[model samples]
Target: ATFEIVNRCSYTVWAAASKGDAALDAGGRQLNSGESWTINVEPGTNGGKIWARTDCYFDDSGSGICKTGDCGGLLRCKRFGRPPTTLAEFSLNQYGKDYIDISNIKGFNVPMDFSPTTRGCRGVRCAADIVGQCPAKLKAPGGGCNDACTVFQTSEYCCTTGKCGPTEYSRFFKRLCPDAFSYVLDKPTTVTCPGSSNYRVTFCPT
Candidate 1:
């Protein structure tokens, strides 16, 4: 599958993605305004995600820090990412089909749109300016906003191993992006797309 990642955020964004040895762009990419990068996931690759980080400074060896989504200062992220980052997740050929979803369960930093570019499916987006309206206690050190789960980490929010309920914090996020995965027990949020379909992930879509 091909994922065309576009950055329209007014500033630069360091893109990160992947899990294990996928043919995807399992590394970091520095994208300025109006720039983009496309990645391909091989048939063997099962699951992974695409996300953008803000205010980063990387060295020649791709070692640096980002305000959000910092993977231990490694430009090429070997894992998902830190908290409060918007995400575009995909499971390729899972039980004969592809699954796609955008998540805000962690929280929000950048606005995004995860849409099908092929097969004419309606895409989902987290287009709210979350950071601008973040509550004082849930705000991240940089510019991202934190979720109740990350900040509280209790059964009421984390839902680590059991059923949980949404709190006012998640409701706040829901008010901003209705389609995103706001809380732990969220859903119908995951969309099933065709394995033959391609996608586009746009940052700061607004």
Candidate 2:
């Protein structure tokens, strides 16, 4: 029978035989949020490994909550059933307790802010007037006190007077989230927020 395979966790999983000579291979493409595919599973299939890779999308719901970068610098593989006596149990579970927080963080040091293309209160402004620029009214207030946008470096916020600010504010939710749609560093790196006087987050496995 075809089992309804679901990606409950954040990352994309690679499926492979736990005791076969074939190297671990990725599952049937990447499973995006609320997106699931069918897999043929034998009732006694005891040896398999699902190697988890970073997928920016969320689970079957496609809500964009958890990111695949949540895990540490290593690829996480979940063992299906168990491996044969001669083989290993699959050691992809290095995510540990520090997984989620570390990977979601961005490492951009320069003062950066964003102007979104669509959605949210800021979307009202048409792009023609100021392409890649936020209107004066939508600019952030000061000292990063008034911040908007869910993702990092994706959108900008307007202060009381609707004037933009000097510092760049990463759109914490969208731009810097798991499988961030935008540019992601090739490797895990640390980023600090200048205004906060504290590191924004820890090393992200790029």
Candidate 3:
């Protein structure tokens, strides 16, 4: 199937996808305002994630930087993006279903909406302006909101070792994006749909 990424923001954005050894069409090119790009993917793809990069400047050598969502200074991301980025995660064709979600657990740099193009699949989104209201201590250097785990790095905030629950920071994200994964232990964050459904991922859906 294919994933269609739509850029509804006023500025240009570089859309990136992280799936094993998969090269993004157009060499991970930039999408202008109101533009869209479609990328093909195989069924049963798991642990795949997609995100947008902002304030980026790359030369012919692809060595530059993005103020937000930088992935090892490479225009073509081979790994996950840095923190303070909104993520659309998926596990396709898993046990006869497709699991998908929009996660703010790494913090949110942009508003995003993920919806199944096929009928009977539920939509999930996180379109709040978290940067405007981001707490001072949890604010990123350039822009965006930082998750509690990125700020505190404690077991309590990260839920790394033991059974941990939501904290004040997690609640803050949940309040704005109830359907998003606010923390590692956030429940019901995964939306299960029937297999083989194409998805439409929109940036700045509002």
Candidate 4:
């Protein structure tokens, strides 16, 4: 017989070692944003459990937006944290020789920006870098310029106040990598600049 573990949760689920000194070390390590592992379990042989958690936020839509008060249920352990809904677990069984199929485990949405920060857009300095842009007529939420001349700023361009609108530079970036991780200025994993250009993206880790 063969079996596989499945995640019935609507959010990204993670698994980590649940015993031994490794468990202690696991507590100190942060899992990758999009990562998973596979195990070959045998009955009456290797019986072990794993640990994992989801990235929670205050936004009811699960966007990880900050809310008033102590982020309430944002962080948790096995559904103990806030943001209410979280990834839940299901069981699987495996015996003898067989193949298990596990697919499409929705992972973390995006890293959280805990402190004041910004990101690069297109070729400019905006919230997410100018990756995508929409005309004012579309009335894209969090978009539109406070002033038309605002587009001409040579450095440190300002973005429309709110979620969607960004400077021309950031709009440029979105145009290139729309589905790419929204760049967080203060918490970046890497910073890339072409040739000797002064342009750069800063990453914030806190």
| 1-206: candidate 2 lDDT, tens digit per residue | 12233344333432222223322332223554334444443332323322223333345632232122122222222222111001112221133211111211222111111112122211010112111233233232221111232223342332334444333332332333322211132232222111111111101111
Candidate 3 deviant stretches above 4 angstroms? 20-27
| Model 4, residue 2: C-alpha shift (Å) | 8.7
Residue range 1-206, candidate 1, lDDT tens digits: 78889999899998888764532565678889999898776754567888889999988988888889887788888877788788888888776778888888878989999999988457999998899999898999888998888888788888877787778888899889998888878755888877767889999998
lDDT of 3 by residue, 2-80 (tens): 8999999999998888863564443356899999989876788888888988999999998789988888888888777
Model 4 lDDT, full chain set: 0.25
Q: How big is the positional error of residue 118 in model 3, measured in Å on the Cα after superposition?
A: 1.3
Model 4 per-residue lDDT tens digits across residues 72-148? 23321212121111111112222422111110011121112111112321221123322134334222233221122
Q: Which portions of model 2 show Cα errors greater than 4 Å? A: 8-27, 55-206
TM, every model: 0.94, 0.22, 0.95, 0.19
- Off by more than 4 A, model 4: 1-3, 23-37, 41-47, 56-206
Candidate 1 local Cα displacement, residue 135, angstroms: 1.6
Worst 10 residues of 4 by lDDT: 98-107
Q: Which residue pairs collide, candidate 3?
A: none
Lowest summed lDDT window (length 10), candidate 2: 122-131
Candidate 1, residue 28: the lDDT equals 71
